[PDB]
A paper describes a structure:
HA is a trimeric class I viral fusion protein with a globular membrane-distal head containing the receptor binding site and a membrane-proximal stem housing the fusion machinery. These two regions of HA have two essential functions of facilitating entry into host cells through binding of HA to host sialosides and membrane fusion upon entry into endosomes, respectively. Endosomal uptake is necessary for infection where the low pH of the endosome triggers conformational rearrangements in the metastable prefusion HA that lead to a postfusion state and subsequent membrane fusion.
A cocrystal structure of F0045(S) in complex with H1/PR8 HA was determined at 2.69-Å resolution. F0045(S) exhibited well-defined electron density and recognizes the hydrophobic cavity at the interface of the HA1–HA2 in the HA stem region. This region consists of residues His18, His38-Leu42, and Thr318 from HA1 and Asp19, Trp21, and Glu38-IIe56 from helix A of HA2. The amide carbonyl of F0045(S) makes a direct hydrogen bond interaction with the sidechain hydroxyl of Thr318 from HA1, whereas Cγ2 CH from Thr318 makes a CH-π interaction with the A ring. Similarly, the C ring of F0045(S) makes CH-π interactions with His18 and Trp21 from HA1 and HA2, respectively. Nonpolar interactions of F0045(S) include contacts with the sidechains of Thr318 and Val40 from HA1 and Trp21, Thr41, IIe45, IIe48, and Val52 from HA2. This network of polar and nonpolar interactions of F0045(S) with residues in the stem-binding site appears, then, to stabilize the HA1/HA2 interface in its prefusion conformation and prevent pH-induced conformational changes to the postfusion form. Overall, F0045(S) buries ∼130 and 171 Å2 on HA1 and HA2, respectively, of H1/PR8 HA, which is a fairly small surface area compared to the known small molecule, peptide, and antibodies targeting this region. The key differences in the F0045(S)-binding site on H1/PR8 vs. apo H3/HK68 HAs are the presence of a glycosylation site at HA1 Asn38 in group 2 HA, the orientation of HA2 Trp21, and the presence of Asn49 and Leu52 in helix A of group 2 H3/HK68 HA that could all lead to steric hindrance of F0045(S) with group 2 HAs and render it group 1 HA specific.
Residue numbers in the entry:
A (entry chain A), C (entry chain A), E (entry chain A): 11 to 54, 54A, 55 to 83, 83A, 84 to 95, 95A, 96 to 125, 125A, ...
B (entry chain B), D (entry chain B), F (entry chain B): 1 to 171
The structure:
């Protein structure tokens, strides 16, 4: 009579690597590296993202007419920009602190688009019909939906001084613009004042703008420029504009709400009726594995991104079924 | 292996033992058969489950981490952010791969140790009532029925019960 | 006769964790994680810290009257600010490069407060009695101790041009201010010049300041603003001020010395007659352990901060006393 | 254990052996008693002291590290500094916990190895002059006084001195 | 007859450290820490570096006369500055965004120095012979090789407006300067206009410069200042200068090419006829080891820098030849 | 050692065995001599070569990494860049030294394990035809010529061929 001591073997072809040996066939193992995604843009914990479509951050906040208008009140879990965002800043100019504005929006979870300065009520004795061809819509010349080009009325540009008190209970993002004609003749024809100025003041913001006239190369068939500025009016604070020309006045501001875990991503995938706890620009990840080699840009509760192509931990024995 | 049992003096594994990682194969007049050792198998399962769960837990939940944008006059800050991201990625890839390799080596050595410990336990139970015919097997110097095989498998082998017969057959 | 081989056991209840097993009772172990502190602010290597009390960095450097005046010459190992620092910038305005100034002070180990421009000697034909209610002291209106509000004297504000040569052998922090009235009437009443300017020049610093007049929301019952600027005059260099109005002139500058291992912390603990090699906002650490889970902000020679709740390394055996 | 001695064929520990980690318990006509093995105990103490000191030394002195402040128009730089701090903290917590776990496992295995090595040394010294009665014990086939026990404990056991008596009693 | 089982031993004195023991003599080992270098500056993958000699980045780009002129077209793998770069900004002033310019040059692999505005063709009715003693050469007063000091001609400084179209197919670094006299008398004597201005515009760049007059401390025996500005004209874009005084006009621009793996280092070693894949400020590294304790600043394919003094991995056994 | 062979019951090494890490020394009427065991030596060489190559490969190629410059009003950014560089350097020095120490310990234990496994294989081959005279040696109970020594060294020892003579000499 005999008795033997042995160990398990099966038809497992799983291979793991050790420090002393590579490609060790084992009976049981566990994959720690997640490489699978659905290739879709899904909701993040029940909240759909904010898709800007043809627009980017600048074009959406300024109100580019070429982009489909969004609902007045929106809420999202993350922002999505398309790689070929052709509609953004339509009139040539510089967006001051645009990256800081994107970083601020990265923690925003909701906006309410309201009329801070009504068009036919806020700027008397001034023309509010100024449009341009660089911001065309349906072939015709147009202008931003959230801004208003104030020009001379009846050969006179009286000094305007308006203000808004923030009674929304939240931060109010306010955007405006400063125009710079290429020559002084256009300056007189548009604002009737060669020594014009703009002043924007709050309780913590204070800036003065002076037009700078010079011939500039044609960008979008425009020799003049238009610098865009923004600020975050705190709850209860008052913002005051005072100008005698060159002021691209605000018309629609944004009532913002702060959140956590949000961010801005550039994705090419489409939105589907799905939900996930982890979103990448390539697709959603439904996994509890610790690692993933899909994309370094992650939104939500995701595995740690690594460059590895294989992360498998052996749980069984050395498979020797011979 | 590090303990010389798996792929050592026990050359291969048993596909016929599907109930556990370690066990026995017996042969007597009543017949032959496999039987997994549930104690060592369960202890190894507990240890390896704890190891895997520990490796998974030590990696915290990766929350939202996106890229940032910089204008044409902020190249230094852009390169600094890129250096931070690349260094963190290098460090984490290094840690993950190294930990996986180390734990794989240690798990193989752990299975080897368990097999060797089971063999040595059976050997110290049997003493000179059986001879080591190699390949991790013992040939009894006495008749060992299913009751005797079960007393061997659960650690209650009666040495004086078969000592006289084993001494007679050993001559 | 028999002899046995065995191992040690005791009444130790210490538990450690392994990769294969948790909560292993062992005979001997060593704690590597320091979780104990004294809850006091102590000296750091024999040098007491600099406690600003009711003031912050801005209020202390500008000379807010609401804070108890410090000794003329001081030396410290680290700076402490209270969480509820109500006394800082008392006249509404912007502190330009204030965070960079804090970062510069983070490596400063000593200061000597000296009179760079005497009050009754530096600014002839100008009034030096300007005070405000936003910087009140003992109920009465007052002003910064280190600055001087120059106004019109006898209906005329002559162009002042003063300078200081640094013969202190060290860096000299010099602070000044620029006032911005809300209207031009107050501008004429205070400085008699509508086109005023300020100029501050050194060998490496050069800046010009122009007043910007506009009605602004009331902050501390003040519609005007006061922007604060600073510079570090190098040893041997000369600083020159040239102004015809709106200049909040310097009166006391700081002779600074550079050191190592210092920093600025926000703490709620009190100063005690004690000494340590490691200081946290929660208390001092007297330990040689490699890790600590007390606070990530550390001053001096401290253990590495970790989020762990337990870091115990086994030195003995598996305790089996049965 | 990894070597099957601690919590293995030697079931429990000895509270009566206070002088060291490993040792012996003897019993003869002159009486019984414990005695720690100072050589293996001292070598283990040296090794584990070196291990602990190494783990402590590899962590350099954490010098002054405080937070920084940023104005409302420097949110990107603030988030970059926060990301740097959080990544370093994650990495260091991970390293500390992982190293502690690995070294604890290795220390337990080291004690197991020391116990097994001591037992095997005693066994190879005794040879067939004593029988393995399990539980890490040996029953002599001859009279072994305190001098013989001391010659066993320090590695100078005289096999031919008791070979004849052990063969007679072994029969 | 006897047979024994044993292990190898030799006369090896190699020592390694373990977790349980230090200074373990072993039979075989491998050194992973590279500590050897040749102490020379070599080519990097067949391309010689760009040595600025007596100049730094600023002095080389502006065209300091004290430095030997380089070839019109150059290509390099990395830039080398000497620690004692005495020739840089020779006329006292501020180099705006100089560090960002260095960071931009860090990815440049080639330059072509061409004449963007010829001296005797671009600025009619203006004097182009302005020199200074702060930028002396061979004892005589001189000026930058790449800039031109435009002054008044025949008692009149007509408004100049010039432009350059980039048809080089690559980025064009253009540098210019703005002069600030200490008094208005010199302003009238040099530019005949007290209210002068400069304007530099491209398709993405737009800046206006106004002279600021004030008495300043003597730096290099000069009371005036000269601020230096730069821009990167994109291929196909046009740069336009428009000034009526104080314009230090450009004369030579740089046609730049982008590359990878380059950088700027400060070294004291000399250039030798050698080639390497790894370059440090102390010397070149010819090694395949993973680590090195030579220098943290590396160019090319280098080992990872560590502070360690010894990194030796045992491959053999514990050497016991007794 | 962890397995008690190197610097254990085999006290020292053999300088006369230059052909490998592990082997044998035989002595019979035909003479004496060393002979390295090529199988275990080659397997150890493969394993340690893989270990060294793995440690070298896990460290990626360090590409260009130079310092940056900052003006007098960018002290926070300068300190942030310095903190990033110093933290990465600390982490990498820590990882390198720790990995070297761990792998050195594991390599010593691996050699110990290989030596012990070779000894146990020879012992299980010889059985009672030879006696363990300690120091990792076996004294045969029969005449073992060069052919018998070679059959011992390559794992084809014929036990019944010398069983009768070994039993006669063992008496
Ligand atoms: C990792 O290990 C596995 C298993 O050892 C390797 O897979 C095997 O690769 C060998 C080639 O080296 C295959 O062998 C060939 O098989 C055919 C079958 O008809 C036979 O005709 C040839 O003469 C030759 O023997 C083998 O089939 C294959 N087995 C499996 C299950 O895939 C694998 O290649 C290793 N990977 C690496 C990267 O080393
Ligand atoms: C880590 O291990 C220790 C020791 O094994 C655990 O402590 C023990 O916990 C058990 C409960 O699981 C306690 O048992 C109870 O004891 C009372 C005593 O009268 C008895 O009446 C109950 O029937 C039950 O057996 C045990 O006393 C306690 N011992 C000590 C020394 O604390 C500990 O809970 C473990 N921790 C974790 C997190 O697993
Ligand atoms: C690491 O280990 C090596 C080898 O054990 C150490 O080297 C040795 O150091 C000892 C001193 O502790 C030297 O001993 C002296 O040797 C002279 C030779 O004439 C003798 O006269 C003295 O009485 C004493 O024994 C020994 O020669 C030397 N051997 C070699 C090969 O260097 C080394 O010091 C150790 N390093 C550390 C940091 O511990
Ligand atoms: C180990 O196996 C043996 C069988 O060989 C068990 O022993 C017998 O137990 C059954 C049921 O309790 C009795 O009917 C027999 O009379 C027993 N035989 C002898 C010879 O005692 C034993 O109980 C098992 N041990 C454990 C812990 O399960
Ligand atoms: C190990 O223990 C033995 C005791 O059994 C020691 O031997 C004896 O040593 C004493 C004192 O040196 C003598 O008086 C006895 O005559 C010795 N007895 C025999 C039988 O020789 C031995 O010295 C110890 N070994 C070591 C290294 O300490
Ligand atoms: C192991 O060594 C033995 C020598 O002891 C080898 O056996 C002999 O092989 C030679 C050549 O093949 C023959 O001429 C002898 O007649 C053999 N002797 C016996 C007793 O059979 C054996 O081949 C070796 N094994 C391996 C795998 O190389
Ligand atoms: O490998 C595993 C495993 C997988 C994942 C984890 Cl987290 C832990 C473990 Cl232990 N197993 C789980 C239990 O079953 C074992 C088995 C052994 C022999 C025969 C059949 C099944 C195999
Ligand atoms: O655990 C330790 C220890 C603690 C800290 C360090 Cl840094 C190193 C070590 Cl080795 N010990 C120190 C020596 O005494 C040992 C002992 C063993 C058995 C009985 C009584 C005491 C126990
Ligand atoms: O240590 C090594 C070694 C070095 C570097 C690497 Cl990457 C791998 C290894 Cl294995 N050796 C290489 C083969 O030869 C071995 C030897 C053993 C005994 C006697 C003479 C030579 C010794
Ligand atoms: C492999 O094993 C699995 C599980 O027992 C079984 O379902 C499958 O049919 C097997 N395949 C082969 C080819 O053996
Ligand atoms: C996600 O994966 C789990 C298993 O990991 C599965 O049960 C579930 O259906 C998947 N989908 C969703 C939406 O959870
Ligand atoms: C535990 O052991 C210590 C040290 O020997 C002793 O002082 C203490 O009294 C013991 N306590 C108990 C409850 O055994
Ligand atoms: C600090 O701790 C040590 C022991 O770690 C102790 O001796 C000392 O009294 C404590 N206090 C001071 C001020 O050192
Ligand atoms: C050491 O060994 C090497 C290699 O065998 C040999 O060349 C050298 O002469 C030896 N030196 C001594 C002093 O033994
Ligand atoms: C560099 O080192 C290698 C060996 O590592 C050597 O063959 C070569 O000659 C050295 N020099 C060059 C220029 O490669």
């Amino acid at each position: 009579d005999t008795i033997c001591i042995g160990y398990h073997a099966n038809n497992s072809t799983d291979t793991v690597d050790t420090v002393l040996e590579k490609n060790v066939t084992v009976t049981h193992s566990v994959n720690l590296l997640e490489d699978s995604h659905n290739g879709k843009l899904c909701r993040l914990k029940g909240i759909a993202p904010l898709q800007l479509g043809k627009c980017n951050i600048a074009g959406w906040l300024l109100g580019n007419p070429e982009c489909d208008p969004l609902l007045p009140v929106r809420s999202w879990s993350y922002i999505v920009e398309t790689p070929n965002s052709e509609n953004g800043i339509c009139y040539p100019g510089d967006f001051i602190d645009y990256e800081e504005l994107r970083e601020q929006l990265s923690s925003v979870s909701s906006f309410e688009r309201f009329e801070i300065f009504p068009k036919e009520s806020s700027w008397p004795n001034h023309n509010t019909n100024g449009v341009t061809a660089a911001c065309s819509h349906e072939g015709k010349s147009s202008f931003y939906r959230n801004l208003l080009w104030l020009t001379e009325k009846e050969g006179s540009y009286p000094k305007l001084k308006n203000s808004y008190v923030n009674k929304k209970g939240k931060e109010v993002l306010v955007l405006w613009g400063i125009h710079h004609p290429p020559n002084s003749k256009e300056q007189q024809n548009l604002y009737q004042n060669e020594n014009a100025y703009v002043s924007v003041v709050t309780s913590n913001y204070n800036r003065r703008f002076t037009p700078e006239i010079a011939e500039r190369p044609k960008v979008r068939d425009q020799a003049g420029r238009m610098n865009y500025y923004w600020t975050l009016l705190k709850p209860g604070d008052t913002i005051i504009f005072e100008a005698n020309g060159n002021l691209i006045a605000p018309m629609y501001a944004f009532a913002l709400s702060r959140g956590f875990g949000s961010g801005i991503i550039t994705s090419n995938a489409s939105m589907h009726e799905c939900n996930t706890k982890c979103q990448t620009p390539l697709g959603a990840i439904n996994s509890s594995l610790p690692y993933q080699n899909i994309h370094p840009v992650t939104i939500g509760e995701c595995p740690k991104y690594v460059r590895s192509a294989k992360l498998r931990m052996v749980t069984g024995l050395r498979n020797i079924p011979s | 292996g590090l303990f010389g049992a798996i792929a050592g003096f026990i050359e291969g594994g048993w596909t016929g033992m599907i109930d556990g990682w370690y066990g026995y194969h017996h042969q007597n007049e009543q017949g032959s058969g496999y039987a997994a050792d549930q104690k060592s198998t369960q202890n190894a399962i507990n240890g390896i489950t704890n190891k895997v769960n520990t490796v998974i837990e030590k990696m915290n939940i990766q929350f939202t981490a996106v890229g940032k944008e910089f204008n044409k006059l902020e190249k230094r800050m852009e390169n600094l952010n890129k250096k931070v991201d690349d260094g963190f990625l290098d460090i984490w890839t290094y840690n993950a791969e190294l930990l996986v390799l180390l734990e794989n080596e240690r798990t193989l050595d752990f299975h080897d140790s368990n097999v060797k410990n089971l063999y040595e336990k059976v050997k110290s139970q049997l003493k000179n009532n059986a001879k080591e015919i190699g390949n991790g097997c013992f040939e009894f110097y006495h008749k060992c029925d299913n009751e005797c095989m079960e007393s061997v498998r659960n650690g209650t082998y009666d040495y004086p019960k078969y000592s006289e017969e084993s001494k007679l057959n050993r001559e």
